[PDB]
């Protein structure tokens, strides 16, 4: 309903500029009339989910690329899409004027925006915090009598989450992940570095750490927030590494297996939070299928594990088929879920590239590849960062789909925002991935979903410079004649009856 105000910062595409008085907006999603299709188009050139409509033809003739919908070939159901309410994200959002804050929250959580239904919530501090803390820093408090939420939760994160839920028309799923335990539960007595829980699963250290999960869910419940899921630990492989620079807690796959079996599983299951899902791994997919094999071949661990959370940071060294594909094959009833992604974290990556089309394409390519390998959802990292890509107590700066410029009471919606939106806006929870087969080899990335009501949603990404004319065949309905421009992303919607 309100167009993008474009601004170039000298990179491959534009950001859309928002402030207290203006932000670009979309309409709530709707399917067009039977026999018509909708096309939402974003381009490097600067189109931002521009709506065009076309007819569905009874016949098609030609030798060009055909993508044929396989609507009765059913894969995973979709949980959803969203991002992380870090301390850094909360600080950036609340540094804006209240009207600017509302337009940023609407961008993500409104049907005028991209309809996020997932918020990941750190359990106390991570790198994207300005101070180091846990919920239980009083030494040797095994009873956790001194467990409490500081202001980072009560003043920043929780009130922002309430405002997001109020804007959300869809049910929102909260996902909790811890970086570090209290240092007095750790072998190394520090938030960072190589260090695990003292002792072994089944003991006072592991029982106390399990009870910390319940104390956290209790405290959020007192604040009228309920969680869909928790992870067993953020990137447990990190705490196994000498000199690891920020908050971590090391687990081998065997350590995680026994902790889940003996401590975390039984503790959650024997609490009011017994319906909260437990996701294992929450780490790079290079660790699959090995981590899944170690944890899930133990039936006493398996009975507590709902799903396998994956991070994207080693995807470039970890082919999807050998990792996601093999894991699904071995454990088809254990959902795969992408829980953390950002650009700018790598040695060779600039922290923030305002308007980067490449970074948008990174997001959509990842989401498509994940969806094609049974993954049920995809979660961004920081919801918002400053132009340096912070704040961050170890100066570990990265990129975010929204960059806040507090001196101008402004925020910038980057390509990543729109690329994520091409999925989140149009793929409600309960959508199911269906087959989509190419007539010939092509440079496109494409995924088909059946909306809960039986309607079709197809996303087509062209990471090539070349315009690709194509046809989409829906065998029951007809043919969509279209064109995939170089460096474009499209979402197609059509009814099937
Ligand atoms: C929040 O951001 C808003 C958009 O960046 C700000 O509003 C804008 O303010 C500037 C400066 O006064 C105006 O720019 C001038 O632009 C007009 C052209 O106007 C119209 O055409 C543009 C371009 O296509 C179109 O986007 C608008 O809808 C208008 O119809 C020129 O004639 C001038 O020479 C000068 O360049 C913008 O017109 C104006 N945009 C809008 C959408 O209102 C607003 O100031 C910011 N708020 C705060 C508190 O800073
Ligand atoms: C996920 C992690 O949970 C989060 O705290 C972090 O900010 C993410 C992005 N990231 C990484 C870095 C610097 N990396 C290192 C190794 O210090 N800055 N931001 C992300 N962490 C991913 C680590 C992957 C390393 C693989 C070798
Ligand atoms: C479509 O193709 C069929 C099969 O050749 C043909 O007989 C029919 O007349 C065509 N229908 C339309 C609506 O073009
Ligand atoms: C920890 O909790 C106990 C029991 O409520 C209290 O008496 C004690 O003073 C607390 N310690 C700190 C450091 O707050």
Numbering used by the authors: 1 to 497
The authors write:
Gaucher disease (GD) is the most common lysosomal storage disorder which is caused by inherited deficiencies in β‐glucocerebrosidase (glucosylceramidase, GCase, GBA, EC 3.2.1.45). GBA is primarily responsible for catalyzing the degradation of GlcCer by hydrolytic cleavage of the β‐glucose moiety from the aglycone to yield free ceramide and glucose. This is achieved with retention of β‐anomeric stereochemistry of the released glucose unit through a Koshland double displacement mechanism using Glu340 as the catalytic nucleophile and Glu235 as the catalytic acid‐base. Here, we report the design, synthesis, and structural analysis of a range of cyclophellitol epoxide and aziridine inactivators and activity‐based probes (ABPs) for human β‐glucocerebrosidase (GBA).
Consequently, the O6−Cy5 tagged N‐octyl bifunctional aziridine ABP 6 was synthesised and its GBA activity and selectivity were compared to the parent Cy5 tagged cyclophellitol aziridine ABP 8 and cyclophellitol epoxide ABP 9. To investigate the accommodation of the two functionalities of ABP 6 by GBA, a co‐crystal structure in complex with bi‐functional ABP 6 was obtained at 1.80 Å resolution, demonstrating covalent binding of the cyclophellitol aziridine to the catalytic nucleophile of GBA. Specifically, the reacted cyclophellitol adopts the expected 4C1 chair conformation, with a covalent bond length of 1.47 Å to Glu340. Furthermore, unambiguous electron density for the ring opened N‐alkyl aziridine warhead was observed, allowing the first 5 carbons of the N‐octyl chain to be modelled. This was sufficient to establish binding of the N‐alkyl chain to the narrow active site channel formed by Gln284, Tyr313, Lys346 and Trp348, which is consistent with the complex of N‐acyl aziridine 3. In fact, the N‐alkyl chain of ABP 6 extends through this pocket towards the surface of the protein, which may provide some indication into the binding of the fatty acid portion of the natural GlcCer substrate which is thought to project out from the protein and interact with the lipid bilayer. Unfortunately, whilst sufficient electron density for the O6‐triazole linker and subsequent amide group was observed, the Cy5 tag could not be modelled. Nevertheless, the O6‐triazole linker was found to bind in the hydrophobic cavity formed by Trp348, Phe246 and Tyr313, which we reported previously to accommodate the triazole linker of ABP 9. Additionally, this binding cavity extends towards the broader hydrophobic allosteric site at the dimer interface where we reported the BODIPY tag of ABP 5 to bind. Therefore, despite demonstrating that the O6‐ and aziridine nitrogen substituents of ABP 6 are structurally exclusive and are accommodated by GBA in two unique active site clefts, ABP 6 exhibits no further improvements in potency or selectivity for GBA over the O6 mono‐functionalized ABPs.
